[PDB]
UniProtKB/Swiss-Prot annotation:
Effect after changing Y66H: Lowered kinase activity
UniProt GO BP: 3'-UTR-mediated mRNA stabilization; angiogenesis; apoptotic process; bone development; cartilage condensation; cell morphogenesis; cell surface receptor protein serine/threonine kinase signaling pathway; cell surface receptor signaling pathway
Lineage: Eukaryota, Metazoa, Chordata, Craniata, Vertebrata
Summary of the tissues where the protein is detected: Brain, heart, placenta, pancreas and skeletal muscle. Expressed to a lesser extent in lung, liver and kidney.
Keywords, comma-separated and alphabetical: Acetylation, Apoptosis, ATP-binding, Cytoplasm, Kinase, Nucleotide-binding, Nucleus, Phosphoprotein, Serine/threonine-protein kinase, Stress response, Transcription, Transcription regulation, Transferase, Ubl conjugation
UniProt protein name: Mitogen-activated protein kinase 14
Domain Protein kinase: from-to ranges: 21-300
Gene from which this protein is expressed: MAPK14
């Protein structure tokens, strides 16, 4: 049966949630809505509750609401944010207007852990291993993050990590919103594959190893120059693959530079970490190491377990190429809310 709801004002909005969720407290923004910490009295867990802001105001909003819910309902992995609950105060489809999403509450994000300082090699091993384990799973479902960064890697006290905000994607200037992006998507070179996320992992791993942003560009061009100084200018082979004639033409105009020595860039770092970095930070996305391949790298020998790195069940995203009206997206969303079954 339907739980009893109570009303409360939180982020200049009235949150209506089941009684089981108590002591709601703002913890900031999430993707397409604000997030509150809460105590789930039924499970004894601290949870994160995101209220989607105007989930059905446009076709774009309605489709993205459906998109997020489908993603959350599918993902069942230790290193990937999962859905504990989804609710609406609405008693019917015609009343249906608000969507709330409930996940585990994590203690911090990876930015909070970095704090201008280096981390130990074993801690870097454990953190990056978990990211790649989570990415292997996500990528196996043909889902791409596209915007992986320290702020969407959530970690608890004992360094257990979950990936947030995948499958959904202010890019101007000296900002962490662009520092982790693969150049092929930063400058719209081509149709981009899953290893855009592996570029991001490389950027994050370097930062955990040095305590410093790898490519802190002040803008798109400055960031590209920082990147190419490290990995070298593209060869003829990659140039052909740049389907954007405009992007390719600009690239060829640049003075050619050789790849730098990563051992001279990351002094004192584990030679295996350096090796893995060289395989992640490859300009040609076709040649970049994959998550599955990275997990088998010698750098993760003490964590790697081929029988404990699962892939996802088939994920039907045929809806992505479907044109529908707001009410049609809204009804599909409602069906998904109603049919939800909580995890064990
Ligand atoms: C509530 C929720 C629902 C959906 C998704 C999501 O990832 N959707 C795309 C489709 C996959 C993410 C969340 C989510 C969880 C969350 C958990 N803990 C914490 N803890 C915070 C403490 C303070 O430090 C930063 C982390 N912040 C969080 N945030 C911000 C969130 O957005």
């Amino acid at each position: 049966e339907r739980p009893t709801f109570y009303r409360q004002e939180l982020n200049k909005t009235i949150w209506e949630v089941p009684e089981r969720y108590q002591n709601l407290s703002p913890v900031g923004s999430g993707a397409y809505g604000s997030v509150c910490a809460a105590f789930d009295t039924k499970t004894g867990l601290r949870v994160a509750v995101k209220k989607l802001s105007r989930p059905f105001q446009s076709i774009i909003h309605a489709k993205r609401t459906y998109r997020e819910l489908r993603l959350l309902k599918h993902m069942k992995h230790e290193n990937v944010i999962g859905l504990l609950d989804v609710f609406t105060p609405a008693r019917s489809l015609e009343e249906f207007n608000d969507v709330y999403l409930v996940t585990h509450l994590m203690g911090a994000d990876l930015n909070n852990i970095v704090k201008c300082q280096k981390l130990t090699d074993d801690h870097v091993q454990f953190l990056i291993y978990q990211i790649l384990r989570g990415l292997k799973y996500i990528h196996s479902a043909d889902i791409i993050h596209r915007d992986l960064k320290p702020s969407n890697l959530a970690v608890n006290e004992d360094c257990e990590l979950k990936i947030l905000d995948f499958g959904l994607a202010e890019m101007t200037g000296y900002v962490a919103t662009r520092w982790y992006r693969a150049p092929e998507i930063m400058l719209n070179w081509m149709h981009y594959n899953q290893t855009v996320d592996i570029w991001s992992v490389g950027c994050i791993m370097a930062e955990l190893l040095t305590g410093r942003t790898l490519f802190p560009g002040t803008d798109h061009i400055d960031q590209l120059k920082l990147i190419l100084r490290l990995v070298g200018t593209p060869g003829a082979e990659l140039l052909k693959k740049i389907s954007s004639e405009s992007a390719r033409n600009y690239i060829q105009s640049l003075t050619q530079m050789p790849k730098m020595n990563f051992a001279n860039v990351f002094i004192g770092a584990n030679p295996l970490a350096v090796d893995l970095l060289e395989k992640m930070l490859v300009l040609d996305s076709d040649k970049r190491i994959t998550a599955a391949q990275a997990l088998a790298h010698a750098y993760f020998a003490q964590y790697h377990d081929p029988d404990d790195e699962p892939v996802a069940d088939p994920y039907d995203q045929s809806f992505e190429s479907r044109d529908l009206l707001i009410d049609e997206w809204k009804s599909l969303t409602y069906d998904e809310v109603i049919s939800f079954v909580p995890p064990p």
